[PDB]
Every structure is written in structure tokens, then in C-alpha cells.
Design a protein around this ligand. Sequence first.
Ligand code: ANP
Ligand code: ANP
Ligand code: ZN
Length: 291
Amino acid sequence: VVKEIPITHHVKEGYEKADPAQFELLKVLGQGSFGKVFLVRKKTGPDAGQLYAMKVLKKASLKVRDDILVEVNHPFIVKLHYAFQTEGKLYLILDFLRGGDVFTRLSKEVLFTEEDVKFYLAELALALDHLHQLGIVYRDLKPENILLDEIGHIKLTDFGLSKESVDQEKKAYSFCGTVEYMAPEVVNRRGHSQSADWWSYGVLMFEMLTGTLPFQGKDRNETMNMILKAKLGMPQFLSAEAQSLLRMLFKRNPANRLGSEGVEEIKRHLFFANIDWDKLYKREVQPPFKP
Ligand SMILES: Nc1ncnc2c1ncn2[C@@H]1O[C@H](COP(=O)(O)OP(=O)(O)NP(=O)(O)O)[C@@H](O)[C@H]1O
Ligand SMILES: Nc1ncnc2c1ncn2[C@@H]1O[C@H](COP(=O)(O)OP(=O)(O)NP(=O)(O)O)[C@@H](O)[C@H]1O
Ligand SMILES: [Zn+2]
């Protein structure tokens, strides 16, 4: 059963309960549809002076199939250090990623290879499948959530949290996730699934390898009509393996799509042939670009 577990409290193993006064505000790290992410410094405690990223929400819950904030930890997913509730607000204290997002780093290159993208896509695959094994769907996957650490290893900004903004204005008009990366069944309000994450994954791959989105229109309904019905030519400058992976990921019907049964059929793909997956998971594979 899809179970909603509300996030009200969390203190990392071996540390003390936190409160907003223990955090000094330094800068705005950015702004997303669930609000701004700020940069804060721990003023007191064993980790005093250390930098963290702070998200401020009204509330956040986690939908899991069949402690969990400890299980979601992954080499390529941000770590939840603190979490607390004051004045109807939920503060989340996470890792501060110093590399910025990936697309920004790619645009700092005149050119890149299929291998460079393959690295990031691989680590991303590990993260996604790890979330799926816990029974978690990432719901809203988009480049803005894919950042780099100081070294260049992938780090996601979230782990499938169902969040709620504090801005009453915007949140009253808030509408789910990002349409460009929506799966055809998600567009059809059939509900999110594991396979939709892999559709979005395929859209990310396409966007990285082409620099363009496969489906985008003048508005939401046109983009959706495109995702559902429009034609999509295969970029002939891609390797056979890449074309294969894209062809297998882009399936409008899930359970006909790659990864609907396991990521093992994604790990074995000829596109990921020279990828040592355990060394990848151990962050022992040298990243293509330093942030
Ligand atoms: N842990 C982090 N460390 C450093 N910068 C971060 C971190 N998390 C987010 N950012 C920055 O903050 C901006 C928005 O982050 P994000 O995590 O997407 O906010 P959000 O609440 O998830 N809104 P949304 O992007 O719509 O889901 C991005 O431009 C990032 O550069
Ligand atoms: N862990 C999960 N496993 C399976 N299905 C899920 C899971 N989490 C959510 N869903 C499905 O996705 C839907 C959740 O979206 P819903 O709450 O109806 O509106 P929504 O705005 O699209 N959700 P959200 O993106 O979190 O704001 C439900 O209809 C579920 O069937
Ligand atoms: Zn949704």
C-alpha cells in the first residue's frame, strides 16, 4: 500500500536536536517551485561552522510502498542532516553541493562525448533504482535537481518528497511536477510509477545528448499532446548503443518500457558496457569534469 509518512523530525545519528537559531544565514543558493534554497552555517554544536543547505517549507511527507530517512542515503543523493518544525514551518537541513548543476557545467564545455554524459547518467541510474528498491518514486525529475559535489560526482537535491510551499500565493496555484519530462501515463493522470522516472530519465539523456528537448510546445497542453502523440526523429549523430537505449526508454506505455522490471536490464545495456558498477557506486570512477 502506498503509505504517506509525514516528515516532522530528524536528527542525524550522533548529534543534538536543532532549531533555526542554531543556523546563520549566508546566501541564497537558488530558487525553485517549492521555494528558495539558502546557504546556512551551523553556529553551535559539534558541526559548528560547517556549511549546510536549508529548505523552508510548510510541510513535507514521503510516499513509500510496503528510519526511512536513514535508508534513503546514497552516494549520489543529498544527505538529510537536520529537520524541525517552528511556527508552522518545516526546516530541512541538507548537504551543500559546491559544484552547481550539471547542465551549467556542460555549457562550460565547447564539446563533450557520449562517455561524459554516460558517467552522469550511470550514477543517476544508481540513485533512481536505489529509491525504487525502497518503494519510492522521484515524481519530479529535472536538471535543476541534478547537481554536482565539489569533485564532480552526481548529487540529487531531493528523494521523492511530497513537499508544500509556504508562499500561499504560488502554492495555491502549484501543479505537480515538470511537464517536459512527464511520462505519457502521468500526462493521462493515470498516476506516477517507477517507469515514469525512467521516461524522465530518457528525456534527460535526450536533452543532454542533443541539447534540445524531445517534446516542447507553445504551452502545457501542446507539450502534453506532443508527449502523447507527436513524432520524434532519432538523431543520426548518436552511437548505435545510445540510439538503442533511447529507443527502449521512450515507450509511451510502461511495462513495455525499459527498467519497468528492474534496473538490471538498464545496467546490462550495451550503452553501459564499459561501466564497472560497483566502483561507480563506490565513487571510484573518475568524473569527466571538475566543477
Ligand atoms: N544542497 C544544495 N546545495 C547547494 N545548492 C543547492 C542545494 N539544493 C538546492 N540548491 C540550489 O538551489 C536551487 C533550487 O534548488 P531546489 O532543490 O530545486 O529547490 P526546490 O525546493 O527543490 N524547488 P524545485 O527545483 O522546483 O523542486 C538550485 O538552483 C540549486 O543551485
Ligand atoms: N510511491 C508510489 N507508488 C506508486 N504510485 C504512487 C506513489 N506515489 C504516488 N503515486 C501515485 O501518484 C499519484 C500522486 O499524485 P496526486 O497526489 O494524485 O496529485 P499530484 O499533484 O500529481 N501528486 P504530487 O506530484 O506529489 O503533488 C497517486 O494517484 C498515486 O497513484
Ligand atoms: Zn504528481
